[model samples]
Target: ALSIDEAFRKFKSRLELNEREQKNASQRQNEVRDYLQTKFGIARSFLTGSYARYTKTKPLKDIDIFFVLKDSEKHYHGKAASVVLDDFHSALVEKYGSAAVRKQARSINVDFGVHIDAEDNTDYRVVSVDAVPAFDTGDQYEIPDTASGKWIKTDPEIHKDKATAAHQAYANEWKGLVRMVKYWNNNPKHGDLKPVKPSFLIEVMALECLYGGWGGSFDREIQSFFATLADRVHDEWPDPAGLGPAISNDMDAARKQRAQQLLFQASQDASIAIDHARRGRNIEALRAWRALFGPKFPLS
Candidate 1:
């Protein structure tokens, strides 16, 4: 993505690849795999996302590999997985340069793996090299009421039960609000709009829009209800950060500033989401979503 090829054939080929990405992605994946394995000891690798799912038109980055570990130390029954994971981490860092693979699949992260698996006999320890470590929750939601609607909570897992309960309930509502706001931003009738972020607004509004006039029915009646909800959310909303009776020494400016700050955060989130989405990175998506929205971005 940062670099561009200039040869007429290269440029024309690049154009063709972009024009019809999925087919090209298959070809590119094999090209990368052959090169990596023949030159480097990359055992197994593959692609995912738009390339795998047939969604991308043209890619700035060509391949997404699902690398397999050469060894599995955690094959014993009762071993904590992290220990083996740690060893693979050490091995990769030693071989590829310290910190070659990042902790989280973050934006600042250059390449993706170092993700290891204990399953040695099987070919793919999991799915895509980056995806095995990063999994999607297969979450979906619905409203019981469209007006002053009560949220529905799902999921029954430890690791994070309490937080998950609240988060899942609101994530549905917020994601919708974000999609609407993002859709509106593109529409342009919203005026010299504040550059709003799809993800941040999803977070801010989830908390702020908690008590909107028409909390329910946002789906059937998005623009009108959500707009009303946004105002209500802004004026009377109690954020995770703020107490209901906030003590802003200066009231008027404080109020405007708070609204601006929240909106700005939303804009920032949208920017981050765009960049991550561009990269076709969901872990970064989850991280950015969590940062701006709170850990509950996925809960609801």
Candidate 2:
């Protein structure tokens, strides 16, 4: 019989990006970076976002690379956000073809055509990268937001630093917990309507929702996290760097309600799992957690 603690450890390991994935992701990331550097004569570029923070979950996609434009490209600063994004799209399309490149709200996505079965580790591949164009402003950087037709302030370095501090403060268990919640959010059961939008929202909320030290058992801590997140999902979560737009802006009233309902239900299920564990029904507890986390959760 597998102990609940051991099950959690295995589950967390399953969510990690395997070595093949790491190699391919970095290779694709570097190719894109070098290509953009030559085309735009970019001042510099580097990895950012959850992937860089080490909070990213498996089946990696949309790994972010921030490209800082050189002085020669300063004209983009005076253009509409959409114009800047379109230019990026065109530049990528020329290299990767229009089918492989996509224009997003704030970044251009370059799909590498890599595929991976999330359940099968041997089939790993890097899916895509997001190329975000930015302009340096001494203290912060500005990136285009096509949805708002304006540039927004952000500092990924600051976000990275804060995540590092939080991870240290929480006895090194914080990032693992965050990855678990992210895996839950990406569960296939949600279908097209995932409980959380912009999955980074989970990391942002966790910085405050999960505090103190590890609670010894992942089940208990996760249950409490779901309950508290359900209650606070309606509140505004600003950018951790205090530069970009509200992180919670994607969750409108209806979406917030939907997230709250799903979180509340997850909390209930977690409580049931804990009860099963206390009553010595180990299999039942594992089944309950599997019901929430789906196929990746081991059932031995």
Candidate 3:
């Protein structure tokens, strides 16, 4: 018989990585980093993406690991983007086996075979890691883009700093809200039709969509976020650091329409939930939220 606010607090905590899970994630990422270091002329490797920014939701897979190549690997800089990507894939395949390693548009993905079911029993495993190979370009880092056969400039550090500043500006509620929306974006109920892709786009949009101080109610804040995102889903969202490619590039017209519609529907649902809570129908409010957020959102 928890209130909607209390339920949301619990939900937020549930989305966070526990101590054991954090330990396992760190240990696993380091294992991949060390293994890659031995194989490549690496200058340094660091965690990037939502995971590094601390907005990663549960099941913790596809954590991004950015590898910066050393001067010894200068020859790779002159080659086509796919060449370096393929070579990194080859190296990973040799270590993790061909089936475990996969090459993507900008990184090599390594599946660690740590399965996690709906019940959060698997605390000692991570699902996968994305290894991105880059070259240090003084101010910004250049990483391969296989689709375009080009090296693109990106600064993860600046992105991180921006996220941090946003979090501070919003009284630390920003990242938690970002994780909540991310969880909704990845909701299994969508049945392979994620409303958002490159998922980082959600975080990027939040940098603008969620503004001002923290609202007292998660339901209201989330509803507002959904409404704003639905309106702006089609707009161009460049990288926060203004270095990398447009973050919103992945959403084509049809996809943007789909996302916009879904977001609009979710916004309506959230509004309904808030209304239910306003009328003291706490259980009904919880159920509506669960409808949007899936099974992880508690109804009790």
Candidate 4:
């Protein structure tokens, strides 16, 4: 049986970013803020996305920064999304002096230089800031969609607030579960059965779990989350954040079915672990847990 106590302790620290890395991310966001304010004549910018909601985990390469354009601004009205995106990309190209900067569907991707860890001296990809230059559309932000060549409406503030409330309502268990799911989504533990779940999608699912109830320990909560999600993947669940309609599926039918089947298997493995732990069968439980997370799960 697996020892729930031992696994939870190690996994708790595994989800967090170290101080040096945290500092790196903060500085990266600050640099973008300063640049936007000085160059674009913006007053202040809002930090949004997973990092802003405290649901960020390892491989945290992207940070979203929202800048609202003034009424008198150049791209606020009548201009194409690509125009603003191109302008931002040009500015980034000037600063980095490299071909790393590119224009995305909505934001300018400023891939900052790589970061070297202070603790171990190992290098990793530092935070890449996504600068969303948007028009202040009274209630919502009309951000650009370069692919569509039009302004799209979204309210990051609403998303941030909903996540904040959900985190608080669940005694911060919500964000931890979100990060855990992200780890699974981001990693390729198995060959081709890995999930292509996005950070926001996982966050909304976590919120749904919180709405229902928490699943005891970290392992149990995640197990329950994946279990519920296995069935719900095919269904359309509305984004509680009011940002948009039901979460859309980027994965095709075959891929989505494979991902859900993997989750279903994981859920069964977790149930076996939970049962073993209940019966004081730590070794049996541990083996089941390993099947779900992999051999990297902490060994007693």
Candidate 5:
């Protein structure tokens, strides 16, 4: 049996190990990507989903990846992407144990991609390699969608630079975003009155943080922007859990509105920023928000 103190100590140690392992996994993902590409002659790869996204509070989980392989012309040509990935998995499993790795394959005309298995829950330990491929797309950077599936791509270097720029922009503003999320999760009444997981709220409160700052635009138009955001969050959000419980008439106005006030009390600064985004009532403020987050040209 473990005492409360013992439990705390054990949990702390587990998290310490978990954080170390997660960092190690992320660091190792590149080596794994290189190894797979060299061994398989893969054309492209990237980290997607949560790992691609910003989830600082969550323990580093796994490296999600996608890749493109040289099409096998002889075997049939339906888009060798899928089979090539299967080959990689079969090869890995043959080398490692069944439990150690997982593979998934999907194809689009000219390319096929793969996603390897990674942890689904909080244990922290995860895979260093995952790949998804794109066919009909160029060998360069991101390939935009097309009717025939063939699409455009930017130069790898330029693509990376742009992506990095975009990422930096997001990161610059991320502190405000993070605080906004935590504020709402800690105090749901400040929001539209809904149940949301900490994970999903990253986006919701991002807007809310905007709301907190742009008084007229953010707050006055909160209902409107929140509605649009709701649709998009529901549609493409790979994950959604942050919004708190729905506003219940059964609940008093006091209980209903306490979350926002609590947020104002906690992270007063970001709470103010959220109001700005809201009062502006338009996402246009986000460009400025990026100024707060994205890299500064002066630094460059």
Candidate 6:
């Protein structure tokens, strides 16, 4: 059976993005920026979301890139978001062709299916690009609501700063904890039981739960986080970082229940494992831990 430390090591190893894949992602990001700036009238672009925050996982789905428009109001606040999106869609279709581009609720989704790196002799599954066009107004950013065709308020700089500060405060364990939670959500074995939490919410939760100090074993830290969630997750647990949730408490009613159920289950399993481990009952501890992670939890 796998020890806690060994299991955590393997867990992180499996989450590693291949260097070749990273390079391709970077290249694709640059090309998109170049097209916006060189062809269109974008001033500059910055990587945001899970990618910029460094909380993204493998088999990546969408990469968010924010374009800093030269003339903020004309490109964003001046027109309806849908109109702006439509214009972006037309521009993308003109550049990458119609088949490769599709507009989403708020961003233009550019699909790049797959590519093999001959130089590195590796296969990579590319993440679809989520190009978010934004108007940065120094005080706060005006990101469009595609549905309402109105501007949405966001403070990405503040969000990033809080994330960085939390990561540093936790002996740099916050990023790993954030990724671990994501892994648990994305892990294949969980299936129906996976937590219905967004990446940003998970980060917020980590800061709320494990920031300041949680020293010693990583295994204990993981268990402790889940254990805390087991009880407190169903409650409001507001965003302490002030980044705001993408969805309000009233939204995603059913999904919230599902996440609560998953958190409760994980909490119980973690508690059992932690208890067993503390009592020197390695077998029971390992078994309980495996129950939380499923088959991929690693066996000796």
Better of 1 and 3 by lDDT: 3
Whichever of 1 and 4 has more TM-score, that candidate is 4
Candidate 5 structure lDDT:
0.38
lDDT of 6 by residue, 1-300 (tens): 667778777766655666776787788889888887765678777777777777776556578888777773354577778877887888888888888899887789987755523221225655578888788778877777776667776777676787888888887767877777776776656575457455556766666767558576767788777766555555665655454443325327687767777777777777778888889888787777666665445655
Candidate 3 to truth, TM = 0.95
The pairs that clash in candidate 4 are 1-281, 1-282, 1-283, 1-284, 1-285, 1-286, 2-282, 2-285, 2-286
Candidate 1 deviant stretches above 4 angstroms: 1-46, 49-78, 105-300
Better of 1 and 5 by TM-score: 5
Steric clash pairs (candidate 2): none
Off by over 4 Å in 3: 119-121
Query: Root-mean-square deviation of each candidate, in angstroms?
Result: 17.9, 1.8, 1.6, 3.8, 14.8, 4.4
TM-score of each: 0.27, 0.93, 0.95, 0.81, 0.38, 0.79
Clashes by residue pair, model 3 = none
Summarize candidate 5's per-residue lDDT along 20-130 as a digit string, tens digits.
655655555565557566566565565553444443322333345555555642242343344544566665665454665565322221111223232123334453444
Model 6 compared with the native: what TM-score?
0.79
The regions of model 6 sitting more than 4 angstroms off are 13-21, 37-39, 72-75, 93-102, 115-125, 188-194, 237-251, 271-300
Best by lDDT: 3
Best by TM-score: 3
When sorted by lDDT, best at the front, the candidate numbers are 3, 2, 4, 6, 5, 1
Q: Lowest-lDDT window of 10 residues in candidate 6?
A: 113-122
Residue 18 lDDT in model 6?
Answer: 66
Per-candidate total of colliding backbone pairs: 13, 0, 0, 9, 65, 0
lDDT of 5 at 159: 25
